[PDB]
Amino acid sequence: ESVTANIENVKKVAHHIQKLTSIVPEIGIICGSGLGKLADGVKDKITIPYTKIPNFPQTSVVGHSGNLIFGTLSGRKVVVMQGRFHMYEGYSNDTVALPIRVMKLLGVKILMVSNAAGGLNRSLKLGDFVILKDHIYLPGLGLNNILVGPNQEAFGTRFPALSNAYDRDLRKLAVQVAEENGFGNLVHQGVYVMNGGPCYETPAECTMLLNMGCDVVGMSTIPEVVIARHCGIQVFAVSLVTNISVLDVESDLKPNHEEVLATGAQRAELMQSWFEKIIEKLPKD
Amino acid sequence: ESVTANIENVKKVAHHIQKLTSIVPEIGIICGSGKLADGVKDKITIPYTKIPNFPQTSVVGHSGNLIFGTLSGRKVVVMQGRFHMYEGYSNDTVALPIRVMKLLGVKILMVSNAAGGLNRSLKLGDFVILKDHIYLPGLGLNNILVGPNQEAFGTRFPALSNAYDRDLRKLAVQVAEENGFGNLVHQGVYVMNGGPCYETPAECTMLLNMGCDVVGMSTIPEVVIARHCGIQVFAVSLVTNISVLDVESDLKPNHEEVLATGAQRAELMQSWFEKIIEKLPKD
Amino acid sequence: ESVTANIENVKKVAHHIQKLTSIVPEIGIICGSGLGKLADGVKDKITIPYTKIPNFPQTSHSGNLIFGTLSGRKVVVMQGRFHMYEGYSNDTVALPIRVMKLLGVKILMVSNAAGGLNRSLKLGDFVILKDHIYLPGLGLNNILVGPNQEAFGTRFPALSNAYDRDLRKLAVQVAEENGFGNLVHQGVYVMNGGPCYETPAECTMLLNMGCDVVGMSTIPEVVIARHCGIQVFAVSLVTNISVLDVESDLKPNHEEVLATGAQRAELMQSWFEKIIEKLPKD
Ligand SMILES: O=c1[nH]cnc2c1ncn2[C@@H]1O[C@H](CO)[C@@H](O)[C@H]1O
Ligand SMILES: O=c1[nH]cnc2c1ncn2[C@@H]1O[C@H](CO)[C@@H](O)[C@H]1O
Ligand SMILES: O=c1[nH]cnc2c1ncn2[C@@H]1O[C@H](CO)[C@@H](O)[C@H]1O
Secondary structure: OOOOOOHHHHHHHHHHHHHHOOOOOOEEEEOOOOOHHHHHOOEEEEEEEHHHOOOOOOOEEOOEEOEEEEEEEOOEEEEEEEOOOOHHHOOOHHHHHHHHHHHHHHOOOEEEEEEEEEEOOOOOOOOOEEEEEEEEEHHHHOOOOOOOOOOOOOOOOOOOOOOOOEOHHHHHHHHHHHHHOOOHHHEEEEEEEEOOOOOOOOHHHHHHHHHOOOOEEEOOOHHHHHHHHHOOOEEEEEEEEEEEOOOOOOOOOOOOHHHHHHHHHHHHHHHHHHHHHHHHOOOOO | OOOOOOHHHHHHHHHHHHHHOOOOOOEEEEOOOOOOHHHOEEEEEEEHHHOOOOOOOOOOOOOOEEEEEEEOOEEEEEEEOOOOHHHOOOHHHHHHHHHHHHHHOOOEEEEEEEEEEOOOOOOOOOEEEEEEEEEHHHHHHHOOOOOOOOOOOOOOOOOOOOOEOHHHHHHHHHHHHHOOOHHHEEEEEEEEOOOOOOOOHHHHHHHHHOOOOEEEOOOHHHHHHHHHOOOEEEEEEEEEEEOOOOOOOOOOOOHHHHHHHHHHHHHHHHHHHHHHHHHOOOO | OOOOOOHHHHHHHHHHHOOOOOOOOOEEEEOOOOOOOHHHHOEEEEEEEHHHOOOOOOOOOOOEEEEEEEOOEEEEEEEOOOOHHHOOOHHHHHHHHHHHHHHOOOEEEEEEEEEEOOOOOOOOOEEEEEEEEEHHHHHHHOOOOOOOOOOOOOOOOOOOOOEOHHHHHHHHHHHHHOOOHHHEEEEEEEEOOOOOOOOHHHHHHHHHOOOOEEEOOOHHHHHHHHHOOOEEEEEEEEEEEOOOOOOOOOOOOHHHHHHHHHHHHHHHHHHHHHHHHHOOOO
């Protein structure tokens, strides 16, 4: 359960960070699939390894620490989160929650997140961007909701509503930007269902998920979104369709993370460009 | 998680309470959405803080109590202060008060809760008698009974057949009918969302299509513990809000309207429970 | 009280067992419903009580690893299972399967008792698992949650052909050619963490999710076996017809489940023996 994502600990992390950068983030960006280049494209960047932030949860990519990247992107002050805390890795709720709440105290108003997901919706193609317009939080329905435990009233209410969790205006903007930049055809909106993971969904599971009205399935993101919505950060989330979910037990096609990475790699340039352009048009200063 | 809800710990809590009161409750009541609590005759109000190894509620200036007394001539114990799983309470913490009730002599547990109305035919303030449930956390390996079975209390694999005693439901309906508010009463399937987030429109749509009538974040664990130890159950959801099914609507479930609709129906709900208890069969 | 199912701990346990037996099993069998007499059929057999295997999970009459030969093949039979509804950890469930891997197991055959959701199912039917819905898994209680043990498998295992189709085809042919093809179905097994039987509403929902049988086990081991590359054959004995009607008097009862399983145990044993008999030998 790392350090409790309470106001005390979150403030402490926040203040440590504020020592290290003069950048007050307006936008938090959770680097998921296809956003690896975005991270690297931050201007006047300050890079703060998780290992350099006391009480910040620790995650590593093959022994390399995740980083907090501060700077501007499309003229906007941002904090890019490079290194996420997936529940399938065993991370506790407080661990996932803390970075988001730190973002809150840091000044973040809008969280943008990407992920890789399997396309349940049969109209989806590989490489499609599915803007999350809603989610089904299977772990949350089953008592693994990231918010289970004492509510941190400092951050939000005991029973947050998740109405407009995926800010409809941000979604309208994102679609708009895709349309204007000639890749609206790649952009869909859909329901993202979280499979706790880390197993890919079996065909029966995919078939069930599809029947439940899920468009894409992934193993991430929702808990972050919940914490974000809980503390009043607006959320924009896109799933990169990194594979078409197999609904048929007899198919020899099988999901594999290498192809997920491949699709993320191939769509990273467009996704970055898209996020940069969305950000450029975020209504403010 | 402070104490395993086994026969020894439970017996100890029961025996302690029995020093504190001579009332042997036949009916255990858990009020989620009165007021009833208030109107129990000759009440002995025992704070949880007074009961060692009994779960203790979070504060807020309102510690929970076991209220013992008579309602409609019947001996009852009212549980004021519930332990909801979304709070991070453990299985043992939720189980124990119910098993305590068993030892104290509770034969019937009556529970109210607030729920989102999934069923489109429902309106705010409606009462949905639970006739069945979908225990999503239970299915997903968070069943309150997960762990060593406490044989003192019940079987390893409890059937949840007639879990919402059909006779109690029939009586409850009859009573609501006889008292001019039968039109408010429905029966349906309660699905537990572990919570504490309200359900997204997509979740509600999924829940509705799973055959769920109302959704809430409580009750089932208690019901499971009760049925496991053979307490009959009557449970009703007050539809404190209509679940929003599509993401377009401004919508928004809110604990405020929960308390509101709650209050609006609190005296009816309490009246109903009293009148039901009035007509329960008596040994 | 739970040792990580990592390569170190699993090797220690495997190596220990290897100093109690020289049977290198190629087939692991996990005794569920209808299995139990299976051990009797095992020849040149050594019983190894779990109590005798350091760091091996311990279970109620302590469970046993039974090594030996069945239908001309080296098998290890796991007698005594670790069910998540008992409170056992993922590591407890995972370790024996991973031990089997190290011991040389190529094929895991498993039976369980299940409620028959599919309305065409009869009591005592065999439903070969051809797929599953791991409700605990979707809900963040997947046995693999935690650091991926790379010695065993990949971070994100696919569950494609989890229920090896060739094993399933063989199983069916054996049933068909031995006069009980009519007892044999294939279906989707959904795991209810349990230990409560499914309410009528739940069964109804599960049926509508596309589930044929419901039980409280098996999937975790299947997931661990698929993760480390063990092929899986799994059969649910329909030990009761799930009740979908909340107005029904019929109810699941474990005594009956045990009774129905015990009744089919002989046929289930014969089936497994005959399947093994026909397994490709290299
Ligand atoms: O089809 C899929 N099912 C579930 N999660 C997926 C799928 N495709 C991509 N992801 C996501 O990408 C990584 C695993 O490859 C995970 O982090 C998961 O969230
Ligand atoms: O629409 C709903 N979804 C889930 N729980 C609800 C809903 N309406 C009422 N409750 C109940 O109200 C409390 C929070 O207000 C929760 O404890 C829940 O059980
Ligand atoms: O109808 C059922 N639902 C769930 N599990 C079942 C059912 N029938 C048999 N089992 C299995 O047998 C034991 C309980 O009797 C459990 O271990 C469960 O996995």
